[PDB]
Scaffold this active site. Structure first.
Site, mmCIF file in Angstrom:
data_model
loop_
_atom_site.group_PDB
_atom_site.id
_atom_site.type_symbol
_atom_site.label_atom_id
_atom_site.label_comp_id
_atom_site.label_asym_id
_atom_site.label_seq_id
_atom_site.Cartn_x
_atom_site.Cartn_y
_atom_site.Cartn_z
ATOM 1 N N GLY A 143 -5.554 6.381 -0.697
ATOM 2 C CA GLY A 143 -5.145 6.393 -2.098
ATOM 3 C C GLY A 143 -5.372 5.136 -2.908
ATOM 4 N N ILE A 177 -12.065 1.687 -8.438
ATOM 5 C CA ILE A 177 -12.934 1.369 -7.305
ATOM 6 C C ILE A 177 -12.276 0.222 -6.545
ATOM 7 C CG2 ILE A 177 -15.309 1.564 -6.497
ATOM 8 C CD1 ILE A 177 -15.569 1.017 -9.973
ATOM 9 N N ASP A 223 5.569 5.856 -16.487
ATOM 10 C CA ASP A 223 4.506 6.626 -15.847
ATOM 11 C C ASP A 223 4.382 6.322 -14.371
ATOM 12 O OD1 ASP A 223 2.763 8.763 -15.916
ATOM 13 O OD2 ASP A 223 1.023 7.545 -16.508
#
Ligand SMILES: Cc1cc(NC(=O)c2cccc(-n3cc(NC(=O)Nc4ccccc4Cl)cn3)c2)ccn1
EC number: 2.7.11.24
Length: 342
Positions: A29, A33, A145
């Site tokens: 995960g 990049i 978030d």
């Protein structure tokens, strides 16, 4: 002679300082990049993230800049700390890419969520999330978030939050790139554009915790329409006092949705999802369900705070402003460049 060298890692070219050896992609995960590598100077394994032309548009620029500034004025074991920041480019005119370097972790939280974890592990990961979130709030950062893909863990169960969430201003402008934003962990106050306080992040913790138990995303959907349907089918239509706090147009849509009584928490999270082998586990399952019922609360005024969540019996066992205004490509490039140069 040249301080840098370039290597092909998947589809991306990584141009890094020679101290970084044996680059290997993480893939998942992570995220953007990100590579694993050996740092010959520190004699330790690192993770290297490449931000490609972060100034290319307003969205990438705001986030790159904000995170570069915060990754500097935040110091906590459960929040990302950077070991290095560099660009292989010599001048502002030549400036293209930013590389961020941190301690190499072992898994992202999505992988851990898929495991059948004991209560010791579950309660320890949640306590750390709550600790990292408490640190951000004290620094005046309200995430909004928080999601498993931006959370990483080590084999010893130590945890780190890798991002700082939503921008102070908005409105989440389009992204002409083949990537979708994960919205399933966002609080109702975020889904319905409401206004918020620190405990907006508690909902996200509740969604993560529920998914660890259920092994399915609690509130899926194509966008906010489908997503809100999942919230009301499971928790029930919210009280009239919460709806008197919504914008007029949002208020209308919400009140005109069909009414649901909402399933009880033993029905949303049955005993069969928890170990039932001992008295110790029977108590831990009831304590976990109690915390879930305090976290997955539609109205933020009735939702548990970070401090009260930390003192909750399932958890307390572990107790031991600039600059979001509109800028052009050139302006953002320079602001980011000088932060990379410090
Ligand atoms: C002993 C060992 C461990 C391995 N680890 C993994 O395979 C793995 C899996 C999943 C995740 C990770 N991970 C991801 C991060 N960092 C970021 O995602 N981003 C990021 C990076 C740098 C700066 C800033 C940011 Cl935000 C850190 N570790 C590692 C592999 C081989 N050997």
């Amino acid at each position: 002679d040249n301080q840098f060298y370039s290597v092909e890692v998947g589809d991306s070219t990584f141009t890094v300082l020679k101290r970084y050896q044996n680059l290997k992609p993480i893939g998942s995960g992570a995220q953007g990049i990100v590579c694993a590598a050996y740092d010959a100077v520190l004699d330790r394994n690192v993770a290297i993230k490449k931000l490609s032309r972060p100034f290319q548009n307003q969205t990438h620029a705001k986030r790159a800049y904000r995170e570069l500034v915060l990754m500097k004025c935040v110091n906590h074991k459960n929040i990302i700390s950077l070991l290095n920041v560099f660009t292989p480019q010599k001048t502002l005119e030549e400036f293209q890419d930013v590389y961020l370097v941190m301690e190499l972790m072992d898994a992202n939280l999505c992988q851990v969520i898929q495991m059948e974890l004991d209560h010791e592990r579950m309660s320890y990961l949640l306590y750390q999330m709550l600790c990292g979130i408490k640190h951000l709030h004290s620094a005046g950062i309200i995430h909004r978030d928080l999601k498993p893909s931006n959370i990483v863990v080590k084999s010893d169960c130590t945890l780190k939050i890798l991002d700082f969430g939503l921008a102070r201003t908005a409105g989440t402008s389009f992204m002409m790139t083949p990537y979708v934003v994960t919205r399933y962990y966002r609080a109702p106050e975020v889904i319905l554009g409401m206004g918020y306080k620190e405990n907006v992040d508690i909902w996200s913790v509740g969604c993560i915790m529920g998914e660890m138990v259920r092994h399915k995303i609690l509130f899926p959907g194509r966008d906010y329409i489908d997503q809100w349907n999942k919230v009301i089918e499971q928790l029930g239509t919210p009280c009239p006092e919460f709806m008197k706090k919504l914008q007029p147009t949002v208020r209308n849509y919400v009140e005109n949705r069909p009414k649901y009584a909402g399933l009880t928490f033993p029905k949303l999270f049955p005993d069969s999802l928890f170990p039932a082998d001992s008295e110790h586990n029977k108590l831990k399952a009831s304590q976990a369900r109690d915390l879930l019922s305090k976290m997955l609360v539609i109205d933020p005024a009735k939702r548990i705070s970070v401090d009260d969540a930390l003192q909750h019996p399932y958890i307390n066992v572990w107790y031991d402003q600039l600059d979001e205004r509109e800028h052009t490509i050139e302006e953002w490039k320079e602001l980011i460049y000088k932060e990379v140069m410090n």
